[PDB]
Amino acid sequence: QSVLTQPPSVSGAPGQRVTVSCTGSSSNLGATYEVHWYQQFPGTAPKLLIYGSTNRPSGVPERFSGSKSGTSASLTITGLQAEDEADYYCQSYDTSLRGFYVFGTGTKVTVL
Amino acid sequence: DQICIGYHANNSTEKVDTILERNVTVTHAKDILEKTHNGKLCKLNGIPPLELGDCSIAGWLLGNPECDRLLSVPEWSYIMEKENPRDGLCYPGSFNDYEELKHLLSSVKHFEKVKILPKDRWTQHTTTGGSRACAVSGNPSFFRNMVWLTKKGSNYPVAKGSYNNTSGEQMLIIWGVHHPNDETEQRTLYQNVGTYVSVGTSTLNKRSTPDIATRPKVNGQGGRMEFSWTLLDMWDTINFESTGNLIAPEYGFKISKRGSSGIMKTEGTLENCETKCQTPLGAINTTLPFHNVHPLTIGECPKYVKSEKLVLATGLRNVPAIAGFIEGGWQGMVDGWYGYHHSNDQGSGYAADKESTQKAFDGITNKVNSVIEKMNTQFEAVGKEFSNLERRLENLNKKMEDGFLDVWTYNAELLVLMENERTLDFHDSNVKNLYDKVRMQLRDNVKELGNGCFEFYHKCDDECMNSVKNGTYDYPKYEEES
Amino acid sequence: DQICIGYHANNSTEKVDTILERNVTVTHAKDILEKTHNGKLCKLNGIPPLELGDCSIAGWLLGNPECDRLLSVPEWSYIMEKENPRDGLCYPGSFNDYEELKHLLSSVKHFEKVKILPKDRWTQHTTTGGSRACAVSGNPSFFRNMVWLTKKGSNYPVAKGSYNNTSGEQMLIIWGVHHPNDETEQRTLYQNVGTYVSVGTSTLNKRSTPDIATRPKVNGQGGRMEFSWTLLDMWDTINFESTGNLIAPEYGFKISKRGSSGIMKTEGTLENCETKCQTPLGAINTTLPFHNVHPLTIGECPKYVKSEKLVLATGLRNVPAGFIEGGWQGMVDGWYGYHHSNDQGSGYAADKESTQKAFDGITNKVNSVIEKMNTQFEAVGKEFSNLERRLENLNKKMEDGFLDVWTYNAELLVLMENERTLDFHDSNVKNLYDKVRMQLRDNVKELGNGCFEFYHKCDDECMNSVKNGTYDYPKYEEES
Amino acid sequence: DQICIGYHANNSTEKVDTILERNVTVTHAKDILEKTHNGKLCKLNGIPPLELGDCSIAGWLLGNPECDRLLSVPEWSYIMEKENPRDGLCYPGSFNDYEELKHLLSSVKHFEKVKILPKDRWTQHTTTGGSRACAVSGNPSFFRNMVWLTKKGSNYPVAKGSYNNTSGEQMLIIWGVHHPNDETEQRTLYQNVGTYVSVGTSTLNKRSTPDIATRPKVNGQGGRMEFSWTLLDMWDTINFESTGNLIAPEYGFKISKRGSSGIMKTEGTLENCETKCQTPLGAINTTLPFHNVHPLTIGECPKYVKSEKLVLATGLRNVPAIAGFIEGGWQGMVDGWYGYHHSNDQGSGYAADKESTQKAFDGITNKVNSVIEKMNTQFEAVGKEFSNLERRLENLNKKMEDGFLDVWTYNAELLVLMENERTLDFHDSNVKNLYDKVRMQLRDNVKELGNGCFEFYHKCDDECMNSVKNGTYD
Amino acid sequence: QVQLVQSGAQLRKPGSSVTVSCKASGDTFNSYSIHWVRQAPGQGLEWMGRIIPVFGMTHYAQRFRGRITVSADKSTRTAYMELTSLTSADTAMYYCARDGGDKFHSSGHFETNQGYFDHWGQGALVTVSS
Ligand SMILES: *[C@@H]1O[C@H](CO)[C@@H](O[C@@H]2O[C@H](CO)[C@@H](O)[C@H](O)[C@H]2NC(C)=O)[C@H](O)[C@H]1NC(C)=O
Ligand SMILES: *[C@@H]1O[C@H](CO)[C@@H](O[C@@H]2O[C@H](CO)[C@@H](O)[C@H](O)[C@H]2NC(C)=O)[C@H](O)[C@H]1NC(C)=O
Ligand SMILES: *[C@@H]1O[C@H](CO)[C@@H](O[C@@H]2O[C@H](CO)[C@@H](O)[C@H](O)[C@H]2NC(C)=O)[C@H](O)[C@H]1NC(C)=O
Ligand SMILES: *[C@@H]1O[C@H](CO)[C@@H](O)[C@H](O)[C@H]1NC(C)=O
Ligand SMILES: *[C@@H]1O[C@H](CO)[C@@H](O)[C@H](O)[C@H]1NC(C)=O
Ligand SMILES: *[C@@H]1O[C@H](CO)[C@@H](O)[C@H](O)[C@H]1NC(C)=O
Ligand SMILES: *[C@@H]1O[C@H](CO)[C@@H](O)[C@H](O)[C@H]1NC(C)=O
Ligand SMILES: *[C@@H]1O[C@H](CO)[C@@H](O)[C@H](O)[C@H]1NC(C)=O
Ligand SMILES: *[C@@H]1O[C@H](CO)[C@@H](O)[C@H](O)[C@H]1NC(C)=O
Ligand SMILES: *[C@@H]1O[C@H](CO)[C@@H](O)[C@H](O)[C@H]1NC(C)=O
Ligand SMILES: *[C@@H]1O[C@H](CO)[C@@H](O)[C@H](O)[C@H]1NC(C)=O
Ligand SMILES: *[C@@H]1O[C@H](CO)[C@@H](O)[C@H](O)[C@H]1NC(C)=O
Ligand SMILES: *[C@@H]1O[C@H](CO)[C@@H](O)[C@H](O)[C@H]1NC(C)=O
Ligand SMILES: *[C@@H]1O[C@H](CO)[C@@H](O)[C@H](O)[C@H]1NC(C)=O
Ligand SMILES: *[C@@H]1O[C@H](CO)[C@@H](O)[C@H](O)[C@H]1NC(C)=O
């Protein structure tokens, strides 16, 4: 139901590479489904950051890039900026329990 | 004293028809037409049928989601299919050479399903597609044995794959083409519009493009899928290529038995019984050469004829001591068909010529075998299906079958009527011949009384009578005759 | 005096063949093969045929301008068509599944013509085109049941239309595609060049494009029209879409009767007569089980056989003392009988018991032979295209095969039965002689010529007791 | 002194079955089933077959490089073809309506090959191509009766041509389409890529495009050629047009005889012999109404039945001076079937009853002729081929043929058994009838001894006896 | 962008129900579906269910079967969610989202379920208390 496991938090200094992992299973990250990522600032609705596991929406910086393999996935933020302090979430479709979308546990990104 | 020559008569109400006369009661007869069936669908040769229930053949082989219980079927003896099944193509469409495929299955008792193109090989395409039309418990889906390949992200790379049949036997492969209801649909699903699907083997060479057009909705959808099939021979390779609109097989079906079977249309279910001959109305356990149960049967069955009865007389006309054959038939002589009845000073008696009866008996049993053993039976599936554009072939097939049925029905009836006449005349000649055999042996030592009896002009005791009833007699003396 | 036993003879010249002997004159016989037809084409079951005359089926259904008299579609019992008709497709072309359509019509007795797509609905297209090939009295024209849609002004908007079959019964829809012999023609008729015609129903999914090519001219035109057809089931919808080259139907044909009929090929016309069995050579008014008039018939007909004569003997061998020496010609009241000479005078009387039993045996024999033949309504024929010769030949082989089986069986049954019939009669008279001999015993001497001479006076009352077998005359039973 | 009446007996071991009894020795019988063939393939009606040997029909008509001995073709009586021939389409491909073409050839005895489109007319195209698949002795080549038209220089002009069918009779024309296995190939052979081939006659309207795709290699090539054919009606014109991928005919085949023939499958060759009926196992020289040699015969043949023995009894049941008729037949009588002993004090012996034997004899020969002359024979080509997608038609054809065979086999066996029963009863009733003819004359003046012999109170001189033999006794 | 306008916050008692709705800028006529997502304070996102107004189809997360109803009325272009058997745990903010992945068509149906939310509503806070 909350299958996509993410690290509670990640961190790094401005200019460093920070990555967020997403681990799923055979029912939802596996089974060919793609993973989407969202960026959320406190008090605001989340917005799409990455989709199709690799693409970014217009308006999203080149600094954000997705990657996927097997039943695991990740989000890479390069060139970490002072403003990149947000919760990030992964999403995919889970075929169990007659089907549902699953969001991950979320990761908080801290800029040092 | 006297001896008389006579025919056995009986308490039979059995009636036989002949060319010259009808309702001839006879002492014995044999019915050679089977009129009874079990009312049950049985296991032919002890092996149960494939019970499709509401699944059509296309539904079964494509993997209609409602045919999930038919995804590992064991060896069948025959295929049992309902007329107008529901679980056919859940996604509206058509199947090419469908009747020809159903015909192929009359030679198949078992298939091994082989995963020739695993759905996870298509790493550049979306393979999770489905629709409400094939939904299970409200959850959209698709045929279990096929992959609907659509765009990944925004791209549809040429889709390719192949399979080299090293499975050990000729394999059945089914695939199809999606024909959208619009251009917007074509772009949404495949990106590319000027698409094609290309398939080939060492013998098959096909290329097809989708037809995008407005169509009436079926099962809620305007679009349609076409399915095609081929048999991939042993050691041959099938190659698929597509720029869109391809429904790829995931599985092929190896033909594992290649024995003789057939497809029966019936609305029933399998019962716990066995048979050597199964008709749609139930099984037939019989030894007779003909039956009148149903025109279409599967198994090795008696010939079907359009008649109510085929009865061979085997016995004598049943016409119920003192008087001989001319008057009628002795109820008393129950030890044969032809015989003597006689009296003297020792005892009244009754007797049967064993020599005459045995020869007549064997003549009749050979007659029956000459009729029934001349019928040639064989396994036959007796049935073909035709498309709605093949009326001139369906009617031709029907005419052929009706034609042969009229010929065999006619021959069976005329042979029975001609033989029954000869049988009854045969028996009549045998008793008359017995009378003459005896008359000639006795010569002038007896008086013919005019009713099939010889009165003696000399005392003739049991020893004298027995010898006469055996072919031995000579008394040139005692001319009481004067 | 003597009583003689024998059989009637007659002034007949009727000859019957058997297995053992040929040309055997018999006193009576029945011909079971029908050889004569009326020479007229009749109204089967009182309903006349559709008389196409010089029109083909395609001409009729498409509306060839020379087939205008057929536009009313009267009810028919059968369709009468000439072989190699003149008025077919006035605009040269082809018709797909044409043989299959002709076959469909063997089950149709009437159509209702329904205006499914009125030509004035095509408000964006020209509906007034035509050509010299279909011209009427010199004026270019086209098929009456179709609309040739061409460009209006300088444009050809996508042409669309449809129909929900609410007519109440399955409908026949015919439409087609024009194939120009140039690109100049494609442009002057439709403007658009990369055109298509798309048609579909819940079962039909067909799309095609025109093939522009140089072709030999037919009826003055190097172009061709391709016609196709479908049956639109009830409540189904047919959708037409085109960017050019569409010949839309204006009318569909509702099948209104769906009874059994057939198409007969003949060069004649309907005569004012009625039948139950119609052949191309004329109607067969009859009751016999077989006929030899023509292999192809429409109706419930006797079985056709390849034979000239099927005759069942029903009487006695006609062989004009007695019995041994030939049955008397004079006996007029039966088949087997007696002479009765006595002192009041001789005369001839039939043995009614013997004759009646023999008589009924023979009538049952005839009925067993003829009543075992089945009849049914059958049109016995199919059309095949020139690319279906293997199938046409298969059909021919089948029909010839069944004909040989039935011809053979009819002839052998007749020959075997005639042999039995004649033996039957000879046995019946011999049995009569013996029935009588056994009763008379020693009161009469056999003269070896079929007569019994009495040793005692036997007058007319005595002869009557002899005939029914109820007597005993011990008076002077002694021979000497 | 006495006249015994009897019938002929013999040293025959010939056995005939009937409905009531089996293995019944008879004095005479006729075998009506032909069981022996020559073992040789002969010239039917004196005209030899076309011996394709290893060539298929397509190989022959297209001009497979190895079927170069079939470029002559004298008139044939039948076509002899091996099953599963080696030389077919040297360039892998398929032939449309092939079974239908082979069917057409069942009515053809000779073709005249006509050069309708000489290969040197396409001056704008290369007409000298070929491939390793059809190579002759290592040299790339192609079908001999066709022209592979490829690009000349750097262009492929539209190819056009036609023929008028002024040859005098309906002509067979074959043409085809090349399907490349790549686009590289499409460009290096034809220059143009979006190509088509268009063929038309007054009845034929076909246009097709090549399909470029990867296929498994056959004979070293991943490419395929398709062949199609038509019949060009007399005085009609065939028009060809192409932008590429056209294999044009150079020759058409005029159908010159249009008589009845057929195609036989056999692995043998023609022998120096002649026949009127030929089956794959050899010629069937015969006159009998039925045969059991092989189901498929070409010619005018006896009917084929699934039976081993069909024998009509024609003679007496063979059941070998003081006895006859009742006790057994006479092996001492040799001049007829029925007769008299005539024993007196001047002599004794045997004499046939010529009136009785002759009537019986003619009845039997008429019977045999009714059985054998009522069979309807005709020339047949006996067979059809079907494609692998026509199994429902192939099976229909098979069922039809098997059905008729069962009907005729059954009728042949039942007619023989019923007739043999009748034959023997006929022959026996004739003896009894003779006995009665004699007892009715000689009413008294003769004592009957119950063994078929009549003893005379009136002594009989040979002229007497004679008088009994004839109808002049008293 | 695509505007999706969500209704405001509400206070409800346990044992009652919650109604949240969003007006879409033509998404009830065009073919993108509307989904509901929940987020408890301090927690991540939870999918609750969806509607496709084009076909009248719905689908719900297992946790709310029998508790969540989703409906829409394209004439006002508004999607609605109703929750019942409300408890004190249902204090999450609710969001509507537009599925920019699976595009639907009339006279047909097709899902791959590989979509994503390209446009989100503002978030309606629901508080549940005594
Ligand atoms: C499909 O697999 C079979 C079995 O491995 C291949 O057949 C063998 O292939 C080798 C060459 O790799 C040949 O020497 C053998 O003669 C083949 N064996 C048989 C039994 O045919 C076959 O070639 C493969 N198909 C393709 C076209 O790659
Ligand atoms: C064609 O017309 C028929 C009859 O009016 C339509 O069939 C009826 O349609 C209504 C509305 O969908 C249904 O309530 C009825 O149950 C249908 N009845 C019958 C007789 O089937 C049919 O839907 C129309 N088809 C189209 C696409 O226009
Ligand atoms: C092809 O040649 C034939 C034969 O010359 C042409 O057919 C004949 O044409 C002449 C002139 O019109 C007629 O008089 C004959 O009656 C035609 N037929 C016969 C019986 O020969 C034919 O017209 C030519 N092809 C074309 C282009 O039509
Ligand atoms: C006929 O007689 C037999 C033997 O006597 C007896 O078994 C049978 O039941 C009787 N049947 C009838 C119909 O009377
Ligand atoms: C008895 O005879 C009549 C006339 O011959 C016949 O119709 C009937 O069928 C016969 N008996 C029965 C019960 O069938
Ligand atoms: C078949 O018939 C026999 C004889 O009536 C019977 O004993 C047997 O139970 C029947 N069933 C089978 C198919 O064994
Ligand atoms: C049978 O025949 C023999 C003569 O061969 C005779 O001895 C005997 O009495 C007869 N017996 C019987 C049982 O009829
Ligand atoms: C035979 O005689 C009958 C006597 O009534 C007569 O009617 C019939 O016409 C005659 N036929 C011939 C051939 O003379
Ligand atoms: C029967 O009569 C016809 C006509 O006279 C004759 O041709 C035929 O030879 C006759 N049949 C025989 C065999 O006597
Ligand atoms: C058809 O046959 C019947 C009976 O023979 C007869 O009454 C009728 O007139 C015949 N019809 C015609 C039109 O001749
Ligand atoms: C039988 O024949 C006698 C002669 O004595 C006669 O009186 C009587 O009427 C006949 N009865 C019948 C017709 O059976
Ligand atoms: C039977 O007799 C015939 C005539 O003499 C003779 O040709 C034949 O060889 C004989 N056969 C046997 C086996 O005795
Ligand atoms: C006839 O005799 C042969 C040889 O002895 C035997 O094989 C055959 O079965 C016999 N036929 C019958 C049915 O008696
Ligand atoms: C058939 O056989 C005989 C045997 O002598 C022979 O003379 C004749 O030539 C053969 N006929 C044919 C057509 O081969
Ligand atoms: C018997 O009749 C035949 C035929 O006329 C004759 O040749 C023969 O001499 C006759 N014999 C006697 C003496 O009756």
Author numbering:
A (entry chain L): 1 to 9, 11 to 30, 30A, 30B, 30C, 31 to 95, 95A, 95B, ...
B (entry chain C), C (entry chain A), D (entry chain B): 11 to 54, 54a, 55 to 82, 82a, 83 to 92, 92a, 93 to 125, 125a, ...
E (entry chain H): 1 to 56, 56A, 57 to 82, 82A, 82B, 82C, 83 to 100, 100A, ...
What do the study authors state?
Influenza A viruses are categorized by their surface glycoproteins including hemagglutinin (HA), which binds sialic acid receptors on the surface of a host cell and mediates fusion of the virus with the host endosomal membrane. While only the H1N1 and H3N2 influenza A subtypes currently circulate in humans, the H2N2 influenza virus poses a distinct risk. A recent phase 1 clinical trial investigating a ferritin nanoparticle vaccine displaying H2 hemagglutinin (HA) in H2-naive and H2-exposed adults enabled us to perform comprehensive structural and biochemical characterization of immune memory on the breadth and diversity of the polyclonal serum antibody response elicited. The molecular details of cross-reactive and strain-specific monoclonal antibodies (mAbs) isolated from H2-F-vaccinated individuals were revealed by high-resolution cryoelectron microscopy (cryo-EM).
To assess epitopes targeted by cross-reactive and H2-specific head-binding antibodies, mAbs from B cells collected post-vaccination were isolated and characterized from six participants from blood collected 1 and 2 weeks after H2-F boost. nsEM epitope mapping revealed distinct patterns for each mAb group: H2-specific mAbs targeted a variety of epitopes on the HA head including RBS, vestigial esterase, and antigenic sites Sa and Cb, while the majority of cross-reactive mAbs targeted the RBS. These cross-reactive RBS antibodies were detected in three subjects (1-1, 1-3, and 2-2), demonstrating that this broad antibody response is seen across individuals after H2 vaccination. We next applied high-resolution cryo-EMPEM to a previously naive participant (1-1, week 20) to see if pAbs resembling the cross-reactive mAbs isolated from B cells in the same individual could be detected. Consistent with nsEMPEM findings, cryo-EMPEM analysis of participant 1-1 revealed RBS- and stem-targeting pAbs. We obtained two high-resolution reconstructions corresponding to unique pAb complexes that targeted the RBS with distinct angles of approach. As the RBS is functionally conserved, antibodies to this site have the potential to be broadly reactive. Moreover, multiple cross-reactive mAbs targeted the RBS with similar mechanisms to known RBS-targeting mAbs, suggesting that H2 vaccination offers a broad scope of protection by generating multiple modes of binding to the RBS. The DNA plasmid and H2-F vaccines induced cross-reactive antibodies to the RBS in multiple participants that circulated as pAbs in serum. Moreover, H2 vaccination induced cross-reactive, neutralizing mAbs with diverse gene usages and mechanisms of binding, providing redundancy that may safeguard against viral escape mutations. All maps were of sufficient quality to build atomic models of HA bound to Fab except in the case of H2’s cleavage site, which had heterogeneous density and was omitted from H2 models.
